[model samples]
Target chain A: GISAANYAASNIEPNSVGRCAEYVRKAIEWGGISLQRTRSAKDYGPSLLAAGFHEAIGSPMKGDVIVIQPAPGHPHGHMAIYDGSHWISDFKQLHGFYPGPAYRSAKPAYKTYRY
Target chain B: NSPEAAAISFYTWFIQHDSDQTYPLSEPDIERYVATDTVGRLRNDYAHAGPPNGVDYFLKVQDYDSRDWLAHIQVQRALMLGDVAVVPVSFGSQDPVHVLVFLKRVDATWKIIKIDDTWEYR
Candidate 1:
């Protein structure tokens, strides 16, 4: 099995190249957290919740999976992995795997899953 | 200008542009507000997102309640380097959204580099 760090290190392209859900799934799988290949970021929360992954009530810890709901007028959602310090995700073609604050100020609704 | 002032200026210009829909690409406002590396990318992203240009993108995406939204910006932290500044901001009633604004100094003028927002689930 690979580590979350390794999986994230490899895939850093935008959603145009890889969906956010795909990145989350691969990271968790490699991190030894088994999960199905969910088709969308919207689906991950429910599936993980049913699989006994609790919704984080406080700050996310290292290796926590953050799932953001789709914003109004947008169809797909987003997800990322917490690397203890910053949330990592495939932001875009220009910015890949960059660390920063989570959620754009304009859209902020999201859920978190942990082992 | 100082980092805070520059960030505020760019955001002010942006929100106003969103509301007024008048600032053209050739206008001095854009030239002065945005950095060289960011100008083209902003235009391209907006154009790709279905707007004719960056200004059009702002205008098209501006909501009727945009002013209220802009008023909710809560800047938490700001760090300035030699020629770059990174400021983190939060929106009204939403602590989960973290917006980071990047700015660079070009010839004594502070210009916007890019803006990135991430969802905080902690």
Candidate 2:
């Protein structure tokens, strides 16, 4: 299986383009886990279970995949993978999993999954 | 105006007017677009700190080729939080840095509140 450091280093982007799931899934696959393709980012929770990821609590560590629930104007919700240091989705999230002010203000529900 | 448009226009005007003057918002025209409180805070910071330590306060760079940077500025769509708007804008393709510009929607007008230059230069 590929490592979390490799997964993060290989797929870092400059910014987000609303492709959170796509990027996170690709990284998980890079780590040799097969997850079902989901329509929106929010639906990936079950896929994580199927792929042997358990619901993790407390501080997120390396190789954790977080599925954020939808809020207003964010119908699809959001998804991202962590590399212990930084969160990576479509981009390296400098401003944490919330990404922007809209998500931060909404304070939506999110769960972290680890393989 | 929309938050994204406000950010784009502000940067466009800012880069053109930028000079050895670190706090370029002192130019009265730019002040019209910014929040009264924002301009005051930023100008005050500049006066107290002097020439921005090493980097430009607005551009978040120690040095950049003005001509090349001026043409390739990138501004992303704004994310709204009630009356507040947070926008992500990049300075140049040559040496890019994302600055998150926060604004407020007041009286049908979007005015800049402040900016956070917290992104890594890529």
DockQ top scorer: 1
* Model 1 chain B lDDT-worst window of ten: B54-63
Candidate 2: where is the Cα deviation over 4 Å?
A1-5, B1-122
Tens digit of lDDT per residue, candidate 1, span B1-109?
6766776665566655432213344345687877765677654543334233211232222212344546765665477656568877654454324567777777887
- Deviation in Å, model 1, residue A37 alpha carbon: 3.2
State the lDDT of candidate 2 residue by residue for A1-115, as single tens digits: 2375357557767666778888888787778886899989989999989878899988878888889887545678888877776667787765467554334434578898876
Which TM-score does chain B of candidate 2 obtain? Answer: 0.84
**lDDT tens readout by residue for model 2, B27-109:** 78866678888778765654454223334556665334556678888988888777689998887776587788889876788
Interface Cα RMSD of candidate 2: 15.3
CA error at residue A34 for candidate 2, angstroms: 1.1
Which digits, one per residue and each the tens of the lDDT, describe model 1 over residues A38-104? 7877668877776568777577576677777653333466677766544556532111121111112
